[PDB]
Design a protein around this motif. Sequence first.
Motif, PDB file in Angstrom:
ATOM      1  N   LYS B 158      32.471  45.495  38.405  1.00 21.68           N
ATOM      2  CA  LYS B 158      32.714  44.470  38.614  1.00 21.68           C
ATOM      3  C   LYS B 158      32.721  43.452  37.484  1.00 21.68           C
ATOM      4  O   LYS B 158      33.143  42.358  36.828  1.00 21.68           O
ATOM      5  CB  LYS B 158      32.222  43.777  39.622  1.00 21.68           C
ATOM      6  CG  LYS B 158      32.345  44.342  40.985  1.00 21.68           C
ATOM      7  CD  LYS B 158      30.921  44.276  42.206  1.00 21.68           C
ATOM      8  CE  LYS B 158      31.191  43.072  42.584  1.00 21.68           C
ATOM      9  NZ  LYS B 158      32.465  42.395  43.024  1.00 21.68           N
ATOM     10  N   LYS B 182      42.617  41.350  38.143  1.00 24.12           N
ATOM     11  CA  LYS B 182      42.618  40.446  38.390  1.00 24.12           C
ATOM     12  C   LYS B 182      41.179  40.568  37.603  1.00 24.12           C
ATOM     13  O   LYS B 182      40.416  41.776  37.814  1.00 24.12           O
ATOM     14  CB  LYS B 182      42.095  39.568  39.566  1.00 24.12           C
ATOM     15  CG  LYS B 182      42.308  40.299  40.410  1.00 24.12           C
ATOM     16  CD  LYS B 182      41.488  40.402  42.353  1.00 24.12           C
ATOM     17  CE  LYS B 182      41.196  38.898  42.631  1.00 24.12           C
ATOM     18  NZ  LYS B 182      39.668  39.242  42.073  1.00 24.12           N
ATOM     19  N   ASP B 184      36.647  39.943  38.844  1.00 22.35           N
ATOM     20  CA  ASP B 184      36.202  40.734  40.231  1.00 22.35           C
ATOM     21  C   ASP B 184      35.840  38.603  40.283  1.00 22.35           C
ATOM     22  O   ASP B 184      35.945  37.937  39.499  1.00 22.35           O
ATOM     23  CB  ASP B 184      34.819  40.810  39.796  1.00 22.35           C
ATOM     24  CG  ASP B 184      34.797  42.282  40.458  1.00 22.35           C
ATOM     25  OD1 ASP B 184      35.343  41.916  42.307  1.00 22.35           O
ATOM     26  OD2 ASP B 184      35.095  43.145  40.675  1.00 22.35           O
ATOM     27  N   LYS B 315      37.765  47.614  53.726  1.00 23.56           N
ATOM     28  CA  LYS B 315      35.984  48.177  53.720  1.00 23.56           C
ATOM     29  C   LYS B 315      35.049  46.471  53.889  1.00 23.56           C
ATOM     30  O   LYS B 315      34.206  46.594  55.082  1.00 23.56           O
ATOM     31  CB  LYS B 315      35.416  48.611  52.523  1.00 23.56           C
ATOM     32  CG  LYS B 315      35.806  47.653  51.236  1.00 23.56           C
ATOM     33  CD  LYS B 315      34.783  47.022  50.039  1.00 23.56           C
ATOM     34  CE  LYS B 315      34.889  46.802  48.842  1.00 23.56           C
ATOM     35  NZ  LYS B 315      34.737  46.467  47.646  1.00 23.56           N
ATOM     36  N   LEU B 316      36.180  45.564  54.075  1.00 20.70           N
ATOM     37  CA  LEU B 316      35.549  44.314  55.107  1.00 20.70           C
ATOM     38  C   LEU B 316      36.097  44.009  56.289  1.00 20.70           C
ATOM     39  O   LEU B 316      37.442  44.492  56.377  1.00 20.70           O
ATOM     40  CB  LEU B 316      36.438  43.242  53.687  1.00 20.70           C
ATOM     41  CG  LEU B 316      35.329  43.359  52.116  1.00 20.70           C
ATOM     42  CD1 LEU B 316      36.332  43.340  51.334  1.00 20.70           C
ATOM     43  CD2 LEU B 316      34.458  42.311  52.111  1.00 20.70           C
ATOM     44  N   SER B 360      43.030  43.089  50.453  1.00 24.79           N
ATOM     45  CA  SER B 360      41.959  43.914  49.184  1.00 24.79           C
ATOM     46  C   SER B 360      41.206  44.062  49.859  1.00 24.79           C
ATOM     47  O   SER B 360      40.449  43.627  51.125  1.00 24.79           O
ATOM     48  CB  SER B 360      41.620  42.610  48.183  1.00 24.79           C
ATOM     49  OG  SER B 360      41.813  43.034  47.040  1.00 24.79           O
ATOM     50  N   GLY B 384      41.843  47.847  43.711  1.00 26.20           N
ATOM     51  CA  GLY B 384      40.749  47.840  42.529  1.00 26.20           C
ATOM     52  C   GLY B 384      40.358  49.240  42.500  1.00 26.20           C
ATOM     53  O   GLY B 384      40.570  50.875  41.455  1.00 26.20           O
ATOM     54  N   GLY B 385      38.818  49.956  43.377  1.00 24.81           N
ATOM     55  CA  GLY B 385      39.252  51.310  42.705  1.00 24.81           C
ATOM     56  C   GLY B 385      39.900  52.254  43.724  1.00 24.81           C
ATOM     57  O   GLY B 385      40.088  52.975  43.480  1.00 24.81           O
TER      58      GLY B 385
HETATM   59  O1  LIG Z   1      35.169  42.319  44.069  1.00 23.42           O
HETATM   60  C1  LIG Z   1      35.920  43.167  45.798  1.00 23.42           C
HETATM   61  O2  LIG Z   1      35.231  44.135  46.568  1.00 23.42           O
HETATM   62  C2  LIG Z   1      36.787  43.038  45.282  1.00 23.42           C
HETATM   63  O3  LIG Z   1      37.595  43.237  44.114  1.00 23.42           O
HETATM   64  C3  LIG Z   1      37.729  44.903  45.838  1.00 23.42           C
HETATM   65  O4  LIG Z   1      37.649  45.450  45.392  1.00 23.42           O
HETATM   66  P1  LIG Z   1      38.091  46.815  45.535  1.00 23.42           P
HETATM   67  O5  LIG Z   1      40.221  46.501  45.196  1.00 23.42           O
HETATM   68  O6  LIG Z   1      37.553  48.197  44.762  1.00 23.42           O
HETATM   69  O7  LIG Z   1      37.938  47.200  47.204  1.00 23.42           O
HETATM   70  C4  LIG Z   1      38.103  42.093  45.825  1.00 23.42           C
HETATM   71  O8  LIG Z   1      36.870  40.641  45.444  1.00 23.42           O
HETATM   72  C5  LIG Z   1      37.383  41.877  47.495  1.00 23.42           C
HETATM   73  O9  LIG Z   1      38.436  42.781  48.423  1.00 23.42           O
HETATM   74  C6  LIG Z   1      37.606  40.637  48.429  1.00 23.42           C
HETATM   75  O10 LIG Z   1      37.133  40.734  49.603  1.00 23.42           O
HETATM   76  P2  LIG Z   1      38.279  39.623  50.630  1.00 23.42           P
HETATM   77  O11 LIG Z   1      39.839  39.819  49.982  1.00 23.42           O
HETATM   78  O12 LIG Z   1      37.862  39.879  51.549  1.00 23.42           O
HETATM   79  O13 LIG Z   1      38.518  38.095  50.101  1.00 23.42           O
END
Ligand SMILES: O=C(O)[C@@](O)(COP(=O)(O)O)[C@H](O)[C@H](O)COP(=O)(O)O
Lengths: 452, 448, 452, 91, 99, 105, 99, 105
Positions: B158, B182, B184, B315-316, B360, B384-385
């Motif tokens: 991040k 994008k 973070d 994960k969320l 995401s 991302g990951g």
């Molecule tokens: O900071 C993070 O965790 C991410 O960059 C995901 O990273 P990964 O792709 O590595 O998991 C996104 O901001 C989240 O998905 C936001 O959550 P939402 O989309 O629910 O707002």
Amino acid sequence: YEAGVRPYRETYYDPDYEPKDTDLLCAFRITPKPGVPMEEAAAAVAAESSTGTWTEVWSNLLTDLERYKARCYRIEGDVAYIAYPLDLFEEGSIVNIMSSIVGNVFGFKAVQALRLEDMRIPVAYLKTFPGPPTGIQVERDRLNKYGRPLLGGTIKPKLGLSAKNYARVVYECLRGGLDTTKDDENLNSQPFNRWRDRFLYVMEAVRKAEAETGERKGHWLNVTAGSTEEMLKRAEFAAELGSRYIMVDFLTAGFAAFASVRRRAEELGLMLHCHRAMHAVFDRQPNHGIHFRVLAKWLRMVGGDHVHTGTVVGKLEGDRAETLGIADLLREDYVPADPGRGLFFDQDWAGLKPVFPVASGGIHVWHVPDLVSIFGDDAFFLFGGGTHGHPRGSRAGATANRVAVEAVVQARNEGRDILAEGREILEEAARSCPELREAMELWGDVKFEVEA
Amino acid sequence: YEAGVRPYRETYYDPDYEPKDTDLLCAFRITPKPGVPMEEAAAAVAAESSTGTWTEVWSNLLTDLERYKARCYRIEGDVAYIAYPLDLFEEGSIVNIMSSIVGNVFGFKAVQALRLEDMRIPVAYLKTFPGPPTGIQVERDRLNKYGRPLLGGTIKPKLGLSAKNYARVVYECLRGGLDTTKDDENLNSQPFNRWRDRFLYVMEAVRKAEAETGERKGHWLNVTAGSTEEMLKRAEFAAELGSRYIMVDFLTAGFAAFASVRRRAEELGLMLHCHRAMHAVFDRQPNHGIHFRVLAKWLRMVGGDHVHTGTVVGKLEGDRAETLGIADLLREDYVPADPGRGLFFDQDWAGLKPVFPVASGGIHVWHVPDLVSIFGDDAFFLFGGGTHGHPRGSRAGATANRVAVEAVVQARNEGRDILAEGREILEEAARSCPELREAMELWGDVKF
Amino acid sequence: YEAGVRPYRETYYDPDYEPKDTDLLCAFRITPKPGVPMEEAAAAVAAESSTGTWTEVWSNLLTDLERYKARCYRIEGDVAYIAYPLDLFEEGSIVNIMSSIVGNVFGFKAVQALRLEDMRIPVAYLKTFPGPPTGIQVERDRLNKYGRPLLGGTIKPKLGLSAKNYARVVYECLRGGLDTTKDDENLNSQPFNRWRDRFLYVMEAVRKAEAETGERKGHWLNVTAGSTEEMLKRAEFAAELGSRYIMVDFLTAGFAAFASVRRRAEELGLMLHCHRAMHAVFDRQPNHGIHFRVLAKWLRMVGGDHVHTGTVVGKLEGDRAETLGIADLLREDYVPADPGRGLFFDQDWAGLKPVFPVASGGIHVWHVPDLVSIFGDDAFFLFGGGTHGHPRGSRAGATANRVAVEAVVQARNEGRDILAEGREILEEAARSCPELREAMELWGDVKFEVEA
Amino acid sequence: LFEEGSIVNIMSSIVGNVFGFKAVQALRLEDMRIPVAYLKTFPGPPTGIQVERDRLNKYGRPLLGGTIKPKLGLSAKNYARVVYECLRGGL
Amino acid sequence: MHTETFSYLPPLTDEEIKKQVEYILKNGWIPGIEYTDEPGPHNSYWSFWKLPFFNAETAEEVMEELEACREANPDCYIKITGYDNIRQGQVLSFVAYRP
Amino acid sequence: MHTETFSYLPPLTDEEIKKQVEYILKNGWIPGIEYTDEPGPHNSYWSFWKLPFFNAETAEEVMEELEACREANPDCYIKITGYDNIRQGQVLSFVAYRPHHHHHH
Amino acid sequence: MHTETFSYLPPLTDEEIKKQVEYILKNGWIPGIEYTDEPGPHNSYWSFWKLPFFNAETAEEVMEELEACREANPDCYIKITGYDNIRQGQVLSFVAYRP
Amino acid sequence: MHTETFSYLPPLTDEEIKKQVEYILKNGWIPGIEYTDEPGPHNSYWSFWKLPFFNAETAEEVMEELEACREANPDCYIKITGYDNIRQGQVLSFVAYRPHHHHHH
Ligand SMILES: O=C(O)[C@@](O)(COP(=O)(O)O)[C@H](O)[C@H](O)COP(=O)(O)O
Ligand SMILES: O=C(O)[C@@](O)(COP(=O)(O)O)[C@H](O)[C@H](O)COP(=O)(O)O
Ligand SMILES: O=C(O)[C@@](O)(COP(=O)(O)O)[C@H](O)[C@H](O)COP(=O)(O)O
Ligand SMILES: [Mg+2]
Ligand SMILES: [Mg+2]
Ligand SMILES: [Mg+2]
């Protein structure tokens, strides 16, 4: 209230005082007027740089002098340590620091000589300053130059060159291997060479040398001028032309205008080379003045991307131990004290970016081993006379200096002792570089006395 | 006049009031303090979010409170429906909506917990808003991409990467097949990575990947900053560099600064990705806060081109039924009420442009069948990951995620059941794509 | 590198870690998903608010996660302590703090509820923020009001009043003894009352009441609007009209626009009243959200001159112990920890100005003894309904509240126990003030439950 | 069909070309129902009757006015003399 | 050079193409054919082969046009498109033939 | 076409290159290999030959990759990189192989 | 000095004043009384005599308050007002007593 | 003409004034006396009756100065000030004497 004159030491000498982490601390080397006790001399400096004057005033009782007064808390030898509360200073203003710490106290009858050796900038006050906009690591990324000192040089003659001739010399230097070139500190805008003319022609030279060599180039265009508005105008034109750099004489222009230019530089994406012209007026003598290490801290706080630091071995004075301390103060995240280098306090930089040291003045190829040994990789070495004074001109001179630096770096990385083998490394490299041999033969007998 | 404290119910509870098509309607989930009847708790919320206070004031008689007061007009269970006259609100200002509707009523002793579940924004108030600066249709036309979900991915770690290393990751991702990448949400401008350096390097990577692949590329450059002026400065520079996108954390920056950036994005020709950072602070618990569907409505009104909606399977946390309702709220011209998805009101969108949902968070190739099934083509899927975590790095990971999406889309279009055959579809595609096979093997035992 | 999923606790749970003085520290009350160990829940919060994600990435090896990662360094009961390195945060940006600390971590499947109780802002980061532009002591000087709580009140009905009628109520309140009056948080610019109309007429009322009473007055003109540019325009008009104050809903407008307005306020010489509308959306429940004390620290960092703090005894919820901690966090130079008040860390303010607490909501004359006892002198007490709901209108109501405050102050200064004698002090004062007797009789049976 | 806040757009559609068609030899727009939803895109008067009466401190009667005459031909100073006489006399 | 949707899958057979056309028709969308010899990020307006086939009833009709466009422009990239007038945008676009 | 550090010295032998790789590893820095046919001031991102060699333990392992890259891309410039993740900055970058045409102009 | 409405007519008798109050009540408007010693274009906020008589039922009640205000402020200008909370504005205002 | 703190209470007796002066001194704050014939919002600087009483030890000493000031300026408003040099802010200011005309309007 009790009117009348009291000795300064009654209020402003307090050897029981424990400095706070938020206190700004000064180390003053004090020479009292004969007959003035050291304690009174030191208290006078503390009083007249914080809250006091020469007689008691009724209005003292309208505030808390226990909170606001500076205090000499220790006297050791001829050095007085004075602590200044945080609230005395205007956030982000070097000008205000100077106005208190060195405003009047150097001209008192009771103190015949005074030298500010060092100053502990507390983190609480430090972080009201932004520091350099670029920093060593980002600058190397912008230049794509890694693993060696960087090469530069002042265009000469200092003054008298037309804009077109000025740009020709720049072209020859850059296409010959120098990473950068620079205006002389005293070249601003003059009848023989007006700044818009120089900026335009020089950047044509920079672009051509970059395209022909394939390596990124810069020229430190001097925006120093008589007013802040003019300096900001010249910085805007430098950025419109796509220059990576501008240059400012931060002491002759002054710190208020310096801060203005550093703000505009970052807004415009420019890197800011800082020339220390006038510093020796303040810092040459060991009995009276301000040592350059204090000026260097203030420089990094405002946020110069480079500043000249001395060469030790060149034509201008600079002690090796003090220069090593200055380089640490400019480049490291935390610098412990070491009075052997004139560092009376530790200094924490709490994440402010590091400044490129710039070694310039009277140096040539034979100095490269010592310069690499003193500074390591993170420095600019500037060859003005040492470039244009080459028997074949500026291009050949630039090549000679570039090869000298690279040869010494290569040998160091291989495990060779560049101090014991400095001359042998250069002689080895000269076998493959005639320009280097010619430079070595020309200046082989040119040396300056050195001080450890 | 008659001074003294009266129950809120006597003025602000009117069960015979018929809502007007111009009224703003709220569905409040009320948990009253023990001993406070639901009619009085609802009236207290109606009163203290419109015109009333705790005691009768002489100045009430200077105006016509029958015209201006909010009224609780219906209570079903613990849900109070409250109608607000159109004249109460400042045109085009989400900030004003919140100042009334969620200003003070969530902290009253008489109401132990309170949640805003839904809001009927009248067409007459929607027309005071500009909506997204680009919208789904114009955005696909600018990208020249039709017929599949779009690929994206947050750069990782991040924080901690320099600008130059950061764009290296971007270059590898985009040239590997992701449509976008994008910043973070928490990457703004910091000592290890300043925004000007990042914007410059990223756009070198973008242009380079576009030339190498022949597909239009973008990076969601985060302009989120401490002041509106700094956000606008960063948008201006993204536009100077030719970026197709900027990004804003619209809740942490806040709606007033969000509106400023949205206006400038349209002036500069920038598309606006919106991150919902902080939403879970108050939209997660079912007893208290503001439901995300309300936030999504405000988001579409101000004007974001995309907003995150959740993954359901990642994960969320996320509720499938609610997510389907929110997806319609963001994309459709009209959304009828549906108690089975928590849609309390019919919502006419009055011609406002639609918003891309963005899924995401903790997703990888095995989730693609589900994600395609939930969202259809009009969505971004971000890895991302799930990209950088590939055994062979980001380029290989991006190719795997692009292939998975296209393979599942093809299967769907051929009439296959992508849920029942999801594994077989992916395994078939992996026979021609080693990158995809390696991703499937690495994360085959990772479920949430 | 080793790809694949690892438990968060392998990298982000470190009970051996010693927080640095430059670290930003958070206290999270964590409710894990059943079956998720507390250590893993806490590590997930640390990871996903700093540097980590759900699987190992090759690019981790391009940086120093030992420098940048957040770390849960202690778990005590259901509270996880997490330390965040200084370099993770953008200087001077509350927005950036929120984006990391509360950006995503409240919505994770592995953590079913999460509440941020407190946050230790380190001095190194704190001092990148300016704090309030005015402060309690300067504001009292500007008003010439010393030795008592200050009086204000919200104009009611909240909405529906014309600009002219709005100004009439202001006139009656101010000429009756209130020091200030204010727009309701939700009154901005609306069809029934457009902001330019209100600003103009209100300031006529302010000037007239000031001239007639001889005491300096203010009205907190709400600049809250849909965009930052509009808010700045309304602040400019307030200053052109000579208003001493403006008002902003800092959470509904948001922190980026808030910072813009606080900068413009100081440039224009305006004092900045901050309304906390929306805070209870975030801070009401003890299992999930952000406690107001965190929002209050951020408020003082940006630099609101006042903020509402609760009344304890009024119509809105507010625990006495937690409110006392909030007042200290707003007004004092250093605040030690005290988990009994929800202060899990100490907080140093390193010279940032103090913020006026503002106690408002459902209060009347009978509450004045408790309010003086809770807050002391440095607070505003606001009576909206408690002014305009007086049987004789706003002027009489203002007089009643002003007399109540002054009577309680007088008695306190004389040495009387204003808690044991609160009611007797008011009854004594009512003998000389019919307006106060009428207020006491009207609201004598109106009370709200209280929590210690 | 309509641009928010633009009377110009209303006229460009409603009365743009349809008054000049050979097929319709005369056409009169008698009335128009402006929907609330379109009205809200307009700001309306900058002052309005109520606020204007409050700015003037005049209540309970029609307000008096008058055009200066001759329409054209009066110098500036003479123009202001007539104004002065009218206003000091009760207009 | 990639050509957007389906360009990361193996090149499509005629039978795979026809299934995409059937998908377009099954959903009531309008099939079309575009071609160009200058594909790339700069080109948003490929040449129409006739107009969008508003009257198409069968996928075989579209494949006939595709083969005819193939024969008349062997040097060009040829794409199948599907269009929806409700959202007023293309709902699918992919390259069916590469030179 | 100069290529920054060491490009003003004679072209490096494999023995000289290995000593520089040893310097990178001795200091705990991460060696890498990149290549391109478009060297010049406008190209900040050469092509990775694999990821940086985080797990490299000996200089010979790196030289083997250099030979592999050199044999696969004889028409490309190839450079050794050295990365210090502590400062997050490259600490040494130099070209180890130049294509034939470079030296025959 | 003129005092706006009815200022260009002869000063009103009590009977003429009462008729204006009757006009205010008949239309459902709220009668009020304001007074000042500083009339003029600079003053837009005259002192209220009590509050606007929201509960006034007859004109005689208002005339009694007018006399009381006259007796308590014989050196002031005193005006009758009529107020409509629908338009939210004063619908009538004239000076009933001049010092 | 109101005069800020306590001006909405009945005029203070000498006994009530002395208790307020005792409050100032008990807390270690500095009592002062100021007077003017031009009270009002535009006057931030009344006339000092001597300097602030830094050395005052008892309330009676202050009351004696109040009587002196009151007898010398019967046509002036006179206020007691209390100064806290720690916060550098006035901590209590109130009028102790008003001229005759104040109360006979
Ligand atoms: O900071 C993070 O965790 C991410 O960059 C995901 O990273 P990964 O792709 O590595 O998991 C996104 O901001 C989240 O998905 C936001 O959550 P939402 O989309 O629910 O707002
Ligand atoms: O003006 C000069 O002398 C230089 O241009 C050197 O020219 P040469 O390279 O021809 O000597 C530099 O400005 C000095 O080195 C500055 O001194 P310092 O770096 O000590 O501030
Ligand atoms: O809108 C209101 O209710 C008030 O105007 C109070 O009016 P009354 O004086 O008539 O109660 C204040 O905004 C609240 O006190 C804010 O709550 P807090 O101070 O807790 O943020
Ligand atoms: Mg020089
Ligand atoms: Mg993220
Ligand atoms: Mg309010």
